[PDB]
Amino acid sequence: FAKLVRPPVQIYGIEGRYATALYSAASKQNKLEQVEKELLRVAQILKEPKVAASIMNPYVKRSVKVKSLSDMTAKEKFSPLTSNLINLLAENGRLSSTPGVISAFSTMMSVHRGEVPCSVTTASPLDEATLTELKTVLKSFLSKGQILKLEVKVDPSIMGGMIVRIGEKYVDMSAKTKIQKLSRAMR
């Protein structure tokens, strides 16, 4: 056997077996930034009431789901190493988990330049003068030549603060600090 390029996520399960065999095969010949553009076009033709009618049908035939997608994957735009991959999943019986692999390849390819975004969870939204700081003072932490991304979700049970999660960091400043006043009642 041979050694392979290490993906910077290393997920597990039935996704990350096939979603690393694709990352290692396409990182050879430097086919990396191209192949995500082709995997997002099979990511639209999978959801079709004739294509998805037999991509998850058990009772069609073991063989005719191999010729029907191989004729489909080659003619319209592309003939890269993905045409072998769709032929590889279909030859094994893993056609049901096909949307799982591309959602697994996307999170594996995103970290090659991405951030795994933070999650500010405070209140009803804010103005521009207090948000463009937190979209810039959250860039002062990382410092590795990167372009940050973010999510926002509103929760009122946190009464008077904001929680944020840069990766797996969780600097919590909120109204948990009422429960921390148990030490007054704790002798």
């Binding site: 290393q10 797996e168 960091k169 600097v171 400043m173 948990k176 429960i179 030490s183 007054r184």
Partner: protein, 502 residues
Amino acid sequence: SSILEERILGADTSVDLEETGRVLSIGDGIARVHGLRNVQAEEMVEFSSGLKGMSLNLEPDNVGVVVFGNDKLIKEGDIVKRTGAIVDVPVGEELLGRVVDALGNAIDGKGPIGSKTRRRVGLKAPGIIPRISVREPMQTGIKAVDSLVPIGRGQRELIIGDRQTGKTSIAIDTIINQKRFNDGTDEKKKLYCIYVAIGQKRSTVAQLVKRLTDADAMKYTIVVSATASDAAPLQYLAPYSGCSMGEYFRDNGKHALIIYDDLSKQAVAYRQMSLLLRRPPGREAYPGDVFYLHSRLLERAAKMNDAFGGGSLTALPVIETQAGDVSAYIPTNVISITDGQIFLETELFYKGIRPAINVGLSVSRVGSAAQTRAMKQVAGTMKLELAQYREVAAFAQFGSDLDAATQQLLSRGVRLTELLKQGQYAPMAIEEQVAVIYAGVRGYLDKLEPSKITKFENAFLSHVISQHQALLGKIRADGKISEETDAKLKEIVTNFLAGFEA
């Protein structure tokens, strides 16, 4: 009130970045946590609500975590934090006279314990160089223990038997009986004690603190308590925490004692806690390393050499067995870790021998025979006179008559058997033991009746403490029973026997 306001100004609201793992499941105590990259094994992790837990399994996808508490405040999607410390409990002499839970928080309500030093529950037993042999005695005050099956200081002795035979009472007369040394003057005859309650309901442990506080026994012990209501990772952690307060004493000079009541309930808290972590079962669904569970515990009970401090740490593990069968799985794995045993039975308890000790089977590696010098004289001959009895005294159906030949020897046993019986929560001393044992082996009781020897004992014992106090002080001071001390006792038994029954 000034107390609540001063507690709230001393509170520190420090904030820092944690290291944090989202929860993926929570059921029956196990919380498989996504995230938690740099976590150690056996690290203490802290949930959001105030709970606490210990990450046992490491795995590439998830991280198995068991909870010290209750799993109903924890919902999928929670936050698990990082402390940064393998699991440790407070330690010191400042815990003396308290009842504490399995992580060192007081459940008596006398307040916060002021403790300064913290010691792990997973530390290592000392090896071959820093020990020494067993020089000293440990007095229990039982008369069947101190004479026939003695226990040195630093020796693991196993009290084994059924339910409701005397296993807890044997190890609580021992707690009471060291009252006389602890108010004395020398710092090398004391014995500080520790009781670990595993799998016991709170209407037994709050009742044993009563029995230990009228006799003022609680001023020199600690009670580490993990009741049957606790989480199954809290009954597993309790003897490893109680043994680590014992090694404040032993690693600083003094002498400790520790009772595990019991160790058949620290095993079914390991069988359950490590089946829900998906570990494959062994025999009786016990894990692979129940022998490694008990062995890494019972080897800290050392006896250090005198260039380290010379301190000792006795241990008295209790084991409950089913139907009196000693060939089970967890009994035999712990018979072969301890130096000697005390086999408590049921047919001894009911025929009348209480404390129900099988003195035939209660073997003991004698601990360099540190019985004491005077007891060696009277219980050396007692050991052989009782052994001579047991070979020949099991007929219950007589046909022939040999009063010159056999019936003299078996009359010496029933006078020494009915001498060995005792009461409850009233333990003797050693020179009050030498006196009453002197009168049994020297033929000074063969003209009584055996239904009057228990009555003969207390009238004898009250006469010697009252009228003969300077006699017994020459046995305790000089150690031995001297030949002139043999002379003075020869009249006292016969003067009392002249006017005992009148």
